[PDB]
Amino acid sequence: SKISEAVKRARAAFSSGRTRPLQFRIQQLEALQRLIQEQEQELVGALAADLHKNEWNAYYEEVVYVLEEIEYMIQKLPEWAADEPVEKTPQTQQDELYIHSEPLGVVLVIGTWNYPFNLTIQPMVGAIAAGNAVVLKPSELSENMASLLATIIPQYLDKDLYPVINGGVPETTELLKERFDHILYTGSTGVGKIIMTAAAKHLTPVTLELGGKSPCYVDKNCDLDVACRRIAWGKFMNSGQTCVAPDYILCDPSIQNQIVEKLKKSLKEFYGEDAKKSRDYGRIISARHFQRVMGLIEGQKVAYGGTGDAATRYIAPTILTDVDPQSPVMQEEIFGPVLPIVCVRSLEEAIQFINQREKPLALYMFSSNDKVIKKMIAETSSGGVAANDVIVHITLHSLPFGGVGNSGMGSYHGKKSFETFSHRRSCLVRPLMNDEGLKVRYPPSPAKMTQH
Amino acid sequence: SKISEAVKRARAAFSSGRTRPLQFRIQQLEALQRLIQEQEQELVGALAADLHKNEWNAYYEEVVYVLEEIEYMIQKLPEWAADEPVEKTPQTQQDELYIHSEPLGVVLVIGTWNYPFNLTIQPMVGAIAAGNAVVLKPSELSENMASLLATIIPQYLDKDLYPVINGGVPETTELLKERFDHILYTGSTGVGKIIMTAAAKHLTPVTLELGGKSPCYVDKNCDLDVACRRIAWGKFMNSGQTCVAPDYILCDPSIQNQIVEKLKKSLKEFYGEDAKKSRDYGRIISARHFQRVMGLIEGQKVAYGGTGDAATRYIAPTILTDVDPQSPVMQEEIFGPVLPIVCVRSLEEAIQFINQREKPLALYMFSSNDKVIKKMIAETSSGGVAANDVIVHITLHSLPFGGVGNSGMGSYHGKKSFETFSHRRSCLVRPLMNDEGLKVRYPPSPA
């Protein structure tokens, strides 16, 4: 088949040794920066077609992070690739001990649809930096980006080492029978289990970035003007289709209405009175998810928005008040511009509420109180945490990104991408010279024991 | 069931917050220190009955490593557990950026039989240090240690947080239906796949230390007196039942008989003329494995040893020459005191040979040439490497231990154990103060 041949060619090219020298890896990463500059308008067009993105947010909410990762990894690659001496003991003082980094082999990256350039190419950058071959499986749901990357990736990168696999689930299922040395997947909890199961047949390690509802606890005594503007921004970018968007708010009933008003105000400033007319407001990805998201509004008390247009897959920025934790909107990842507010009486009820559910990819808290921030962190678990902002924590080079529990396993970005797509190999190199100190270890053992 | 109730009690205890303060974790580790000291003869006796270990090798080839791990982790725990600041950008000068370590929850350690104290308790030490509840499943193959641990663990440690699950394969399968937050398994490649498959049903991350044939390449023109004493030590300790034993030898045909003679010489020094009479020589764990290893000698040329005693599961230290790589002794992990020698005509052929096969847990080479060593490393892949010695590299606090590909995934020992059994959580803490610097990100975007 087309699929088996692509993997076969990718493994053969890795076995040929071409990816080992750093010079090669850098050329390929440089070919990706050239891809981003030369294909700028093609990239915008595809995101515009897929998700109603524009020239600005296509770059500054997605493409720029791929470029910054490339530039960063290029400059650090020689340091990261070098053998790493570690601490010696008196018994090993005359030896050399170090960690040797080496590629795993052929890496599979399975992309997703919501940021279809970032979540395909940024993982791929890491895997290329670590000297692996990389097979890419784009999500069909972002149809234009999928077809574009199939076309342009082979124009800039090595053809055998970095193939692109077309199709949907049946192709992905077939692809997953093939033998890989690492699999990174971004998507749903349920497919994450399927992918880990398939990985186990070849004992392949996995990086899984999965689902969850990222909570946003808003403190009673904080500046709600600043809080709600930041919350609104993170929640309603990409029409709410972000993995670390604040899914829902937890707040005291005393401040709920103020939050609604400040969310409304910020939303008006961002997108105007009618968000449908804004260039900067996105659209739901597909008919299936439009119907899914609209379904979550039903039966709820709507404070703002609450309508949608099926023909264009537009959903108005929507805020829900006094939301039942057991209702549909609070029982699945929203991934849409519907912001429910669940009421809690204290920090402690909010912590318990978060802990009774599955561990989220991101945890958010808005507060000026340092002890509230430390307490919430200390008593919960989540992939990453941001206090007094949203989104920005997953873009910083110094902060590895990933889930925990149902939100995922493994991590990447920056140095962690390089580690994730390498095997870190402990090495002990001794002199081959008689050492009396070692003779204590050889049989026969002493006939008389001594104290420890 | 009683397995479900144990796992429930361990999770309820974890969720209480009991394991979070470092003082609690250190008290549990100090209790483990007291256990090792107070139960020394009971441990030796169990290892003697299971594996034919003695007082000396019980401690100096197994128990001591657990003690050193405990002592090292107690001392380093505050530093490791502290929030770790990371590098800022000009865009993030007024923020706090740090990695926060926190327990995973309830960790499962599935032990194995060949080093049944080390490979059950040393992982448990790391998981305790990370603030997890730890459920323990010892291997039934080492029956005496299994029983001992079931009795003495609860006598010294928290009874809810750190339960011991008895039984064999059915009970392990039953245990694998329970939801854990991490599984560490040491054992076989085949069962490793079964573990990972069960873990996927709860999306549980795994540390798998599995099998392989750890190659031992012996260079021409190197000091074979020294090399062969070292190879023989690693190969034949614990009657060859070590994960990183030098499984087989690759050597130039011109030094095959020198290697044979040096191995003999060392074997006689270690274990005398009749190894069956040596207090320092072990026995095979079970009838099944005794027959399996004796079977591997069949069809092979015996340069030394080649006899066995079924009743006590003794197999003489055995050297095999001019071995066909397609023969059974070269198609499975040996895990016994049978050392085959496979001839190769060049360093390059040895690299191809190793690369052609599955990635081994360890790779060994013996050479006085630094370039040889570096080349073999650069062009192969294994879990770990030692040049000019065997075994020793998996005992060092500064060298993470673990496999790659068929020899496994993840790693532990030392600081890496703490990381493995914790979640490392990225934290950004910004001021809640109006910032004109951020305003460019908000819509409307400019033209």
Ligand SMILES: [K+]
């Ligand atoms: K390095």
Ligand SMILES: [K+]
């Ligand atoms: K000695």
Ligand SMILES: [K+]
């Ligand atoms: K032969």
Ligand SMILES: [K+]
């Ligand atoms: K603006």
